[PDB]
Enzyme design. Structure first.
Site: not given
Ligand code: BEF
Ligand SMILES: [Mg+2]
Length: 1006
Positions: A345, A436, A690, A693-694, A786
């Protein structure tokens, strides 16, 4: 209620029978809690420890030891015979609890990396007209929820109205988008839009970044987007790790061997119980030779093999834990050693998911209609205000730059976000929008006022420099961002009264009519306008892709009295003429360890792929930055989107997963489709990621690596968790998985070589007719003690020099090859003849022993006969322990010499001396000293029918044992083609032993 994004807010509120003004009533809530339930995901089932040990017996190798112990038990039922099945059970039970203790220890470490902050929500219910804070699980579809900046979304919400001007949501958890998304309440007509196209929907698990809004809940629990993805992760199947597939393939090979030697011994003894013995029936004689043949097959199974396999994995898993890597299973510590493709990712995994300003420029010199730009760079990569500004790559202080002093003033004041430090995790966080907070983190780095930072602690170091500028210039009303003008300004008076404006470059610079050259106000010309805009296009369009932001000020703004803070059009009318000060460039920067890791992975033959849910602009720009692509290499056929991969031909899709390195804007289900295609090509795929979506891809892969900052759903699907977010730990894990596999083949050959040497001994003893040289009680001490000590020390072998400079191993090749089978067959045939030839030597050729003939030894069961051919031999001497301690010492000494040449597979013992592995030479001195322990203590020489020797007998043991080194060095020489302090140490030993002359004198068959 699905596809609520397609319907207007009237029909969505009408469907639930709820009004936004009043909210849900108590009678409607309990009614909806019945139908829908709690707004929570079902907790993952920690399986019973009793069911946990069940998968510890799913291994084929431990099932062969159960069948071996179950067979050895029934043959003993027909107490020393009960010693072997009892200790095999303890070995299998103690091995199973270590596999359970590891997966239990790995869990407690992972759930420790979790923030159990209670999730709450602010709903509008008819009980009280004011807003009430309730728990997240007490939210039902139809609730009117009001969520503001800094609040996590509790459930899937259909936005009804935006209380602020704009609403920005951080959705990197679910979509992988690195930039905050703006939301609106108008319906999205497409009934099958992706979560990134639903701009009127607030998904659970995400967090608001800028504004305040209200909406109606449309899904809870497992009906949410994080709930549908988690259901998909559970639906995916989990195949066995490639190490378990190798061990099981070796288990069917070990089974075909012990089944052959059981069938062969039976058929060669058939037609042989029709003798005048207590038989009478062929069906009663095939039972006697079956019980001696099956006893020979069981003696070929290495008892301590899975226990030393578990120690090698458990010792390796402890080495990854020191590198901040938590491995759930033991066999999963090898998978990265055979990984061909690493799918990763982008947002949060390869990058930090923390906006950082890395480039800024001001005006240096303007002679006429052309200028020179002072261009700086900053080194930070996270929200931590730990960075250095560099001009011409040398450390520079921004105090003597009047343009940088005013650049930090606009950045610190105009933004309304902040930077807080949580000691709970120990990391700085963003309060408002990410872009920001990048300005807040920048202002602290460039200490324009040179404030003293030595004494300050971490909590006040976050806003130390920013608060200073606020004290110099107090902040009045703010002209907040408008989409049409695409800019944001603030009004500020000192403690004159300048106006600071911040927005898109071309929108701001076009309104600018002057330049802040140092302290002077120089009128800006179209010539210098084209130059500074050219640098913006350099940052926007080039491989150095940066989100550019122009910083300017208004020297002469009209007072607050004449201001109209209710019209968007007049906002651009109050900042007509401005003074361009500078511009900053920010991005989601990759982790500092990611760049060198894709290079080290390339040398090891591993291919890295970026599979992200963000757009192909940010995706490819990070691919060029980390090193996946070149700064000028075109990516026409190497970078695809979720769509562009769908309309690809199956023939074109094949060389896509084989040649494409970037995948952008892919759905959570697409990420596992790409992993499935890569495994269709017979590749061990490792998925790093992470976020939610993974999670389907993290489970579908052969090994899924999650980040410590990742979601809980991601750490559940993963087999490994990087606790400290160190991408280099993946490169260190590949090196360990390759060394463990190399060392595993070493003590697998060494252990099965020891058992085949004991099988040939018992078989040869039966064919020649000699008394038993090796009894099964001492074969248990040999294989466990042994053999277990040198095999455990063989896991500490020095790794190769080209271990990480070669491609990954082919997943089709087995552990034991065809040649390695013949090579340990040769060792087995030696120990068979050596152990039998050592017991026969004492019976025939030794001085102290009786010098009986081969006939007088092949018929040792006929000695108390009157005088057939046994004239002066005693019958008791055929029960003597001296020839039994001769065959035990040769067996033990050969295994010490065979463990010595198992240090390397093909490399000789001169090129690789034994002190390369100091654990191996130390374990041999332990196995040999434990052998001398059995000979000279009081009770053990009676438990094992053995006796101490003398120097003359011990010298004969070495003459029979040592040629096993010459026999393997010869095979190593053949295997290769088709130092000095070591030689000067073995040479005094070889001449001292082989100076004496002796023979075996076996005139008969062998
Ligand atoms: F860019 Be991955 F889908 F978090
Ligand atoms: Mg990610």
């Amino acid at each position: 209620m699905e596809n609520a994004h397609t319907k207007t807010v009237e029909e969505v509120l009408g469907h639930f029978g709820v009004n936004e003004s009043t909210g849900l009533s108590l009678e409607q809530v309990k009614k909806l809690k019945e139908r829908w339930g709690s707004n929570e995901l079902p907790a993952e089932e920690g399986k019973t420890l009793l069911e946990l040990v069940i998968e510890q017996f799913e291994d084929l190798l431990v099932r062969i030891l159960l069948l071996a112990a179950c067979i050895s038990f029934v043959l003993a039922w027909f107490i020393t015979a009960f010693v072997e099945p009892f200790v095999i059970l303890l070995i299998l039970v103690a091995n199973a609890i270590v596999g359970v203790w590891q997966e239990r220890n790995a869990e407690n470490a992972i759930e420790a990396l979790k923030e159990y902050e209670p999730e709450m929500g602010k709903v509008y219910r008819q009980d009280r007209k004011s807003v009430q804070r309730i728990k997240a699980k007490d939210i039902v579809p139809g609730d009117i929820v009001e969520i503001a900046v800094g609040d996590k979304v509790p459930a899937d919400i259909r936005l009804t109205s935006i209380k602020s001007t704009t609403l920005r949501v951080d959705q990197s958890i679910l979509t992988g988008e690195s930039v905050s998304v703006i939301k609106h309440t108008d319906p999205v007509p497409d009934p099958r839009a992706v979560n990134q196209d639903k701009k009127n929907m607030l998904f659970s698990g995400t967090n608001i970044a800028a504004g305040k809004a209200m909406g109606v809940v449309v899904a809870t629990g497992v009906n949410t987007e994080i709930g549908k993805i988690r259901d998909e992760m559970v639906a995916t199947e989990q195949e066995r790790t490639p190490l378990q597939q190798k061990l099981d393939e070796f288990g069917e090979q070990l089974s075909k061997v012990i089944s052959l030697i059981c069938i062969a011994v039976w058929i060669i003894n058939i037609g042989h119980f029709n003798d005048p013995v207590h038989g009478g029936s062929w069906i009663r004689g095939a039972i006697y030779y079956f019980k001696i043949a099956v006893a020979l097959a069981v003696a070929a199974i290495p008892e301590g093999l899975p226990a030393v396999i578990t120690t090698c994995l458990a010792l390796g898993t402890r080495r990854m834990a020191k590198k901040n890597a938590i491995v759930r299973s033991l066999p999963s510590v090898e998978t990265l050693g055979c990984t061909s493709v690493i799918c990763s990712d982008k947002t949060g995994t390869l990058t930090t998911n923390q906006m950082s300003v890395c480039r800024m420029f001001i005006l240096d010199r303007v002679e006429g209609d052309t200028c020179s730009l002072n261009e700086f760079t900053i080194t930070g990569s996270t929200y931590a205000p730990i960075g250095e500004v560099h001009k011409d790559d040398k450390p520079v202080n921004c105090h003597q730059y009047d343009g940088l002093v005013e650049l930090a003033t606009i950045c610190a004041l105009c933004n309304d976000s902040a930077l807080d430090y949580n000691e709970a995790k120990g990391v700085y966080e963003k309060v408002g929008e990410a872009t920001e907070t990048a300005l807040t983190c920048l202002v602290e780095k460039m200490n324009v006022f040179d404030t003293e930072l030595k004494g300050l602690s971490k909590i006040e170091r976050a806003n130390a420099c920013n608060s200073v500028i606020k004290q110099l210039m107090k902040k009045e009303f703010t002209l907040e961002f408008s989409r049409d003008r695409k800019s944001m300004s603030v009004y500020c008076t000192p403690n004159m009264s300048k106006m600071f404006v911040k927005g898109a470059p071309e929108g701001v610079i076009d309104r600018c009519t002057h330049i802040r050259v140092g302290s002077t106000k120089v009128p800006m010309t179209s010539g210098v306008k084209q130059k500074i805009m050219s640098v913006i296009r350099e940052w926007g369009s080039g491989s150095d892709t940066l989100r550019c932001l122009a910083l300017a000020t208004h020297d002469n703004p009209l007072r607050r009295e004449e201001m109209h803070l209710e019209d968007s059009a007049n906002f651009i009318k109050y900042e007509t003429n401005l003074t361009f000060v500078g511009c900053v460039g920010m991005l989601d920067p990759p982790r500092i360890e990611v760049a060198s890791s894709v290079k080290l992975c390339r040398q090891a033959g591993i291919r890295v792929i970026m599979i992200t849910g963000d757009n192909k602009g940010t995706a490819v720009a990070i691919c060029r930055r980390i090193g996946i692509f070149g700064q000028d290499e075109d990516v026409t056929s190497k970078a695809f989107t979720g769509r562009e991969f769908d309309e690809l031909n199956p023939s074109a899709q094949r060389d896509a997963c084989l040649n494409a390195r970037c995948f952008a804007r892919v759905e959570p289900s697409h990420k596992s489709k790409i992993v499935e295609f890569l495994q269709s090509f017979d590749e061990i795929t490792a998925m790093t990621g992470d976020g939610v979506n993974d999670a389907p891809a993290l489970k579908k892969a052969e090994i899924g690596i999650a980040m410590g900052s990742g979601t809980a759903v991601a750490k559940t699907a993963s087999e490994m968790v990087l606790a400290d977010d160190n991408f280099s730990t993946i490169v260190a894990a590949v090196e360990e998985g390759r060394a463990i596999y190399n060392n595993m083949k070493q003590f697998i050959r060494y252990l099965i070589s020891s058992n085949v040497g004991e099988v040939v001994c018992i078989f040869l003893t039966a064919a020649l007719g000699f008394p038993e040289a090796l009894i099964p009680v001492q074969l248990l001490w040999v294989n466990l003690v042994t053999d277990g000590l040198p095999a455990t020390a063989l896991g500490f072998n020095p790794p190769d020099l080209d271990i990480m400079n070669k491609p990954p191993r082919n997943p089709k090749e087995p552990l034991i090859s065809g040649w390695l089978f013949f090579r340990y067959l040769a060792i087995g045939c030696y120990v068979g003849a050596a152990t039998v030839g050592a017991a026969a030597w004492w019976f025939i050729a030794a001085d102290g022993g009786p010098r009986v003939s081969f006939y007088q030894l092949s018929h040792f069961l006929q000695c108390k006969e009157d005088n057939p051919d046994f004239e002066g031999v005693d019958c008791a001497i055929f029960e003597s322990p001296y020839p039994m301690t001769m065959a035990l010492s040769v067996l033990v000494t050969i295994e010490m010499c065979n463990a010595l040449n198992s240090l390397s597979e093909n490399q000789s013992l001169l090129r690789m001396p034994p002190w390369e592995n100091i654990w191996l030479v130390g374990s041999i001195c332990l196995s040999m000293s434990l052998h001398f322990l059995i000979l000279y203590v009081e009770p053990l020489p009676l438990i094992f029918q053995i006796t101490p020797l003398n120097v003359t007998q011990w010298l004969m043991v070495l003459k029979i044992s040592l040629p096993v080194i010459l026999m393997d060095e010869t095979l190593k020489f053949v295997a290769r083609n088709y130092s000095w302090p070591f030689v000067l140490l073995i040479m005094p030993l070889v001449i001292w032993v082989y100076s004496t002359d002796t023979n075996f004198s076996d005139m008969f068959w062998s």
